Write a protein that binds this ligand. Structure first.
Ligand SMILES: Nc1nccc2ccccc12
Lengths: 351, 18
């Protein structure tokens, strides 16, 4: 066969150890999910806006008593209600409180006041993967593989907790000071033992079964991994067009084209992740995640060493001081106004 | 080229969720 006796026993043992880790990870998550005003605004100095979404914005802040820097996600409660994202917001906080994994951002504090909700998490200073990818053009296959392997492990972890992530893209991936990935946004993540049906995600990264309004499962995350690996290695995604509807037609078509510089191993991995047929998609078969981790394209990946953050990263972002923001774009600074009247108090009681 | 086509799509910047 492909493995001799020594490699075969080593791999089996490694896979078993993953099971034991994940079982313990699940019991820790569930304990924390079942039993979670950890600070206040005056405890931080607001430095600079790091990013904005429909919710509000993310600001670099310095915790005054300790001098530590953090990223503070500020959500305007009235905007959240108008956007119909109450459940998404409470769910994101609950996930962030309960998970623990080296590539998942760590929530330090959370609190709320009359007008806003606050999530204070570790500041990830190296910038968005998106910027780095667009600047560099494309990542070499070893560089893309280093990032991919972190997503594989992160999804292996999240899926064992029955969490589907559903919004993988370079825009949602931050680079930390050691060059490793951090995932921060969980606004579309959901606990899904079986199927779910919500149309959500980002056009270029949608699995065909979402587009086709089917009940779908965690395998949509493995399709999105295919799209991510493709985009990292090519510099552009496999399916693009002027308008989303044309992107969708391409996704569901079963056709994908590859750059001529893609290795054969990469193309084979991608044909099996970007597989429209669920009965054949890697990550969705009897062998589970092992079909991906054991694939030839990942043969040089030492999965434990990636997890332990013992692999030297191919790229280490520019790092000056602890509150340096040079790896982030400039955003327009809007003041954080706090109404004298409580807004949407009932909707956010649990936050 | 495919890259040129990507540029022509106009979806080269940060993409929003639906
Ligand atoms: N945690 C964190 N660190 C730096 C920048 C961010 C931008 C968006 C969300 C979270 C962030």
């Amino acid at each position: 066969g492909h493995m001799g006796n020594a490699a075969a026993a080593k791999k089996g043992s490694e896979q078993e150890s993953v099971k034991e880790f994940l079982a313990k990870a699940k019991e820790e998550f569930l304990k924390k999910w079942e039993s979670p005003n950890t600070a206040q605004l005056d405890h931080f100095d607001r430095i600079k806006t790091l990013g904005t979404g429909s919710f509000g914005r993310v600001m670099l802040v310095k915790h005054k008593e300790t001098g530590n820097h953090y990223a503070m996600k500020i959500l305007d409660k009235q905007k959240v209600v108008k956007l119909k994202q109450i459940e998404h917001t409470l769910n994101e906080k609950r996930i962030l409180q309960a998970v623990n994994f080296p590539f998942l951002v760590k929530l330090e504090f959370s609190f709320k006041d009359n007008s806003n909700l606050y999530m204070v998490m570790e500041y990830v200073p190296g910038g968005e993967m998106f910027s780095h990818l667009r600047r560099i053009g494309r990542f070499s296959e070893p560089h893309a593989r280093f990032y991919a392997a972190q997503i594989v492990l992160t999804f292996e972890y999240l899926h064992s907790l029955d969490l589907i992530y559903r919004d993988l893209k370079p825009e949602n991936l931050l680079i930390d000071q050691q060059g490793y990935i951090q995932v921060t946004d969980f606004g579309f993540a959901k606990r899904v033992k079986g199927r779910t049906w919500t149309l959500c995600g980002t056009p270029e990264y949608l699995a065909p079964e979402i587009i086709l309004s089917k009940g779908y499962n965690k395998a949509v995350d493995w399709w999105a991994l295919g799209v991510l690996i493709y985009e990292m290695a090519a510099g552009y995604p496999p399916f693009f067009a002027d308008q989303p509807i044309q992107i969708y037609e391409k996704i569901v078509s079963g056709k994908v084209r590859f750059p001529s510089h893609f290795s054969s191993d990469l193309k084979d991995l991608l044909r099996n992740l970007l597989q429209v047929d669920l009965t054949k998609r890697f990550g969705n078969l009897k062998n589970g995640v092992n079909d991906i981790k054991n694939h030839k394209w990942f043969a040089t990946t030492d999965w434990i060493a990636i997890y332990q953050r013992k692999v030297e990263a191919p790229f280490i972002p520019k790092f000056k001081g602890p509150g340096d923001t040079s790896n982030f774009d400039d955003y327009e600074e809007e003041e954080i106004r706090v109404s004298i009247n409580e807004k949407c108090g009932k909707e956010f009681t649990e936050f | 080229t495919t890259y040129a086509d990507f540029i022509a799509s106009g979806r080269t910047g940060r993409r929003n969720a639906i």
